[PDB]
Design a protein around this ligand. Structure first.
Ligand SMILES: NC(=O)[C@@H](N)Cc1ccc(O)cc1
Ligand SMILES: [Mg+2]
Ligand SMILES: [Mn+2]
Length: 254
């Protein structure tokens, strides 16, 4: 059973889902336009409820954390990272582990680096710490939700309605473009060496959105990290291979 609610954090009413009675608190961080409802069903259902207390949050402007509407300032990943940690603190957790997917993995990396005393362990997949020319072709190619996959679009179109979905996606691409102009096309290359907790980087070898060199780079610069490659995994490996992923995550977190 899962409970949904909102809590006031940094001027916004953030929505989140929570389940479990475990003493090990875990936050599930969704990707672009994601939410606990669309990105973490299998985890909120199957992660061990005796071992963990699981929380899946909706970044401001995403999921049900509306208003406000989503905007992408130069520091939007850092703003989400602060909101995520403040949300867990508002929920009274003294320390937490992070499971971050894609943009959520980027967010998790930043949170671990900026609030090291609050993060126990971290599991991230599909994240990229910077943008290259190869990446540009990829994100520019997804700007138009019209060309998106029918199966991948349906859930977001249902949650937000076509208009908000389409527009926010365009604004997301515009936000990423700004990183390309910065030195090293940096998003969080500089924070990787500051992650002090045990980290597990998972990557689907058939991931069509994030080239593997991005996972290799994060693995290289996050001290003590482990890199797990899934031969058949794509970008949504925690959903397509949920039992395998959940087992992997549960083993690492304990
Ligand atoms: N779903 C998300 O959170 C995006 N980070 C996925 C993505 C990665 C790289 C890209 O070039 C484009 C899209
Ligand atoms: Mg450089
Ligand atoms: Mn929600």
């Amino acid at each position: 059973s899962v409970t949904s609610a909102k809590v006031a954090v940094n001027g916004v009413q953030l929505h989140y889902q929570q389940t479990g009675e475990g003493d090990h608190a875990v936050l599930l961080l969704p990707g672009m336009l994601g939410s606990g409802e669309t990105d973490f069903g299998p985890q909120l259902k199957n992660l061990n409820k005796k071992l963990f207390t699981v929380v899946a949050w909706d970044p401001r402007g995403y999921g049900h954390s509306r208003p406000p509407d989503r905007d992408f300032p130069a520091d939007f990943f850092e703003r989400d990272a602060k909101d995520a940690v403040d949300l867990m603190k508002a929920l009274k957790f003294k320390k937490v582990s992070l499971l971050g997917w894609s943009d959520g993995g980027i967010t998790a990396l930043i949170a671990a680096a900026k609030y090291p005393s609050y993060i126990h362990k971290m599991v991230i997949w599909g994240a990229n710490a910077y943008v290259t020319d190869e990446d540009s072709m990829i994100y520019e190619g997804i700007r138009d939700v019209s060309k998106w996959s029918e199966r991948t679009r349906k859930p977001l179109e249902a949650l937000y309605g076509y208009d908000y979905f389409a527009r926010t996606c365009e604004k997301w691409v515009d936000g990423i473009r700004q990183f390309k102009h910065l030195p090293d096309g940096n998003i969080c290359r500089h924070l990787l060496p500051r992650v002090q907790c045990p980290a597990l980087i998972v990557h689907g070898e058939k991931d069509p959105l994030v080239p593997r060199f991005h996972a290799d780079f994060i693995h290289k610069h996050v001290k003590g990290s482990r890199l797990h490659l899934m031969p058949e995994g794509k970008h949504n490996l925690h959903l397509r291979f949920a039992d395998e992923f959940n087992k992997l995550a549960e083993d690492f977190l304990q």
